[PDB]
Amino acid sequence: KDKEFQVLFVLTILTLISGTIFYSTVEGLRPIDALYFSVVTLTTVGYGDFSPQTDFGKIFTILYIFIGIGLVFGFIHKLAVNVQLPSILSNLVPR
Amino acid sequence: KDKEFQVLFVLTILTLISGTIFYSTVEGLRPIDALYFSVVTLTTVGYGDFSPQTDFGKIFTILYIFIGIGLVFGFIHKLAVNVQLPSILSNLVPR
Amino acid sequence: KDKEFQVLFVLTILTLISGTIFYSTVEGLRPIDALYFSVVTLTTVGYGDFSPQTDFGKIFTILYIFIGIGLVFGFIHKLAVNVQLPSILSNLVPR
Amino acid sequence: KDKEFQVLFVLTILTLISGTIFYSTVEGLRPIDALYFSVVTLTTVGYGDFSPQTDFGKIFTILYIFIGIGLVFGFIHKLAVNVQLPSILSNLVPR
Ligand SMILES: [K+]
Ligand SMILES: [K+]
Ligand SMILES: [K+]
Ligand SMILES: [K+]
Ligand SMILES: [K+]
Ligand SMILES: [K+]
């Protein structure tokens, strides 16, 4: 299950890297703003402080959302159940 | 399962076409902006760079969200489990 | 299952009515804008074209989200599986 | 199950407290606006009336979303099934 989580973890990083590179280059965002934008899109928070202005950027975002949500959400759930939950349970039993 | 995914795939396309046509016509968006708006609403990202200004558009959006989320989300999950997952597993075994 | 869906359906209506009344009165929105705002909050689209300006409105929105998401999402899923799905299947068999 | 819900309930409070403190201090929001922002981020509504302006705040928000969504969503579901549902069923049987 550490190997389940590692694969998902890695795939998320690669996914957020892909959005960082595209949005920084095509839409002109600072690298840190691209990442933060990529994270805020794929978790569907969507503040809208950043949003794509070019048509290429709009098209890309369509496909990035559809390809990216299922992964991101899969990692978060794996993180909650296989990492966050056990550490919670462990804190309720003094060793 | 390719036939499960095809039906959902098709139904999503038709759903996004429906929003493209309405928002372009009633709210005046360029076709590409309507589509991008439709995609950003039904995945609940909701940047808000576009949002309906007319009462008809507001009413329509209410019903489009309720009818449209269950489908969109169903396709994304089908896409993740029946397409994205297998291709991931296949990349871990040289043929 | 029509009785499952009816109860949820009703509970959603009552929930959106509650938000319509509060936001129209406390935040001053037109009734139609309150409803549209209530729908856009509880489905977590969150365009932000409307958002509460008063502290009372901010507090209320906190609790409305937590009480309201589980219901709304429950209705949408019931709608997708017990209404939308069957009608889809029925359209693939000429009577 | 009251003990399931209590643990989750508590963990959510602590999570929203953590965001209240950071956003009030680092981003300068009034305590009430930080809380409301924290709640609106972790439920992925994301109105965007508030959004982090500093790079530290942007980085923090990335990790807060990933750590925080799984919890928040877990509480809401526990709330819907173990508290909201039973009280609904109880209202359909006069004692
Ligand atoms: K959302
Ligand atoms: K959102
Ligand atoms: K949003
Ligand atoms: K927004
Ligand atoms: K979900
Ligand atoms: K969601």
Automatic annotation (TrEMBL), chains A, B, C, D:
This is Potassium channel domain-containing protein. It comes from Bacillus cereus (strain B4264). The keyword Ribosomal protein does not apply. Residues 11-81 form the Potassium channel domain. GO terms for molecular function: outward rectifier potassium channel activity; potassium ion leak channel activity. It is a multi-pass membrane protein. Keywords: Ion channel, Ion transport, Membrane, Transmembrane, Transmembrane helix, Transport. It comes from the Bacteria. The chain holds residues 20 to 110 of 114 of the full protein. GO terms for biological process: stabilization of membrane potential. The chain crosses the membrane at residues 7-26, 56-76. It is found in: Membrane. GO terms for cellular component: plasma membrane.
